Amino acid sequence: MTEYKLVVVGAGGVGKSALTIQLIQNHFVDEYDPTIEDSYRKQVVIDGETCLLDILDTAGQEEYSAMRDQYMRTGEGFLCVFAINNTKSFEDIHQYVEQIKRVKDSDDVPMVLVGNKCDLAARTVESRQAQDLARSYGIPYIETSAKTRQGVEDAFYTLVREIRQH
Ligand SMILES: Nc1nc2c(ncn2[C@@H]2O[C@H](COP(=O)(O)OP(=O)(O)NP(=O)(O)O)[C@@H](O)[C@H]2O)c(=O)[nH]1
Ligand SMILES: [Ca+2]
Ligand SMILES: [Mg+2]
Ligand SMILES: [Mg+2]
């Protein structure tokens, strides 16, 4: 069966682990344990096709930035996550995308931009601001809440589907 190698990236605390754990294990992680680098795998049917999701949950803490090249070499598609209540995390998205593009030596890398924590009302990144950034990349923008599950499957499955247009 087809295996898809997904990598979840973004600034510390934007909800990468919570997003991944909600997809794979169907519960919300309320506590904040910073990640170094974890792996998850799951068999899912997407558009009538059985496939294996291999998901790498990466470190947002800048301390582990040296590990980025290795996983950007391996990953097939990148979920680029910021939190809609954390403008700096939105501003940090580009540093992840620029490096993925260098490492891949390509402008056409399967990616989805994700504005997470859309359940929270303290919004400082407006959806239109993120839409404009996604448009410049030529990639989808999808808002999510790892807490309520809104958009969680859509974001990951859209990323699968971008690796398939590729
Ligand atoms: N309300 C709300 N809280 C969320 C959401 N996603 C994550 N959080 C909360 O935000 C905190 C950080 O979550 P986490 O998933 O660990 O972020 P991270 O991006 O994995 N951090 P790191 O880069 O250090 O591994 C946790 O307390 C988590 O419960 C969301 O969609 N909504
Ligand atoms: Ca919980
Ligand atoms: Mg984490
Ligand atoms: Mg503003």
Q: Residue ranges of the domains in the chain?
A: 2-165
Ligand-binding annotation for 7, yes or no, is no
Q: Are 158 and 112 in contact (CB under 8 A)?
A: yes
32 assigned binding-site residue:
yes
The experimental method is X-ray
Q: Any idea which fold 2-165 has? A: Rossmann fold (3.40.50)
Identify the three-state secondary structure at position 15. Answer: coil
d(Cα 104, Cα 75) in Å, to the nearest integer?
Answer: 9
Element (H, E) at 156: helix 152-165
CA distance 51 to 118: 28
Distance from the alpha carbon of residue 124 to the mean position of ligand 4, in angstroms: 6
Element housing 137 (H / E) = helix 127-137
CA atoms within 13 A on the CB side of 89: 25
Residue 84 DSSP class: T
| CA dist., res. 16 & res. 22, Å (int) | 10
Q: Is the dihedral of CA 62, 64, 124, 110 positive or negative?
A: positive
Of all atoms in ligand 1, which is nearest to the CA of residue 120?
A: 1
| Residue 75 token pair | 């990953």
Ligand 1 pocket: which residues have CB below 6 Å?
Answer: 10, 12-18, 29-32, 34-35, 59-61, 116-117, 119-120, 145-147
Ligand index nearest the alpha carbon of residue 145: 1
Q: Residue 127's closest CA among 78, 80, 84? A: 84
Residues 20/55, Cβ–Cβ less than 8 Å: yes
b vs e for 75-101, b when ≥16 Cβ sit within 10 Å of the residue's Cβ?
Answer: bbbbbbbbbbbbeebbebbeebbeebb
Residue type, 166: H
Nearest CA to ligand 1 atom 12: 13
Question: What resolution does the deposited structure have, in angstroms?
Answer: 2.1
Q: Cα separation of 6 and 159, whole Å?
A: 8
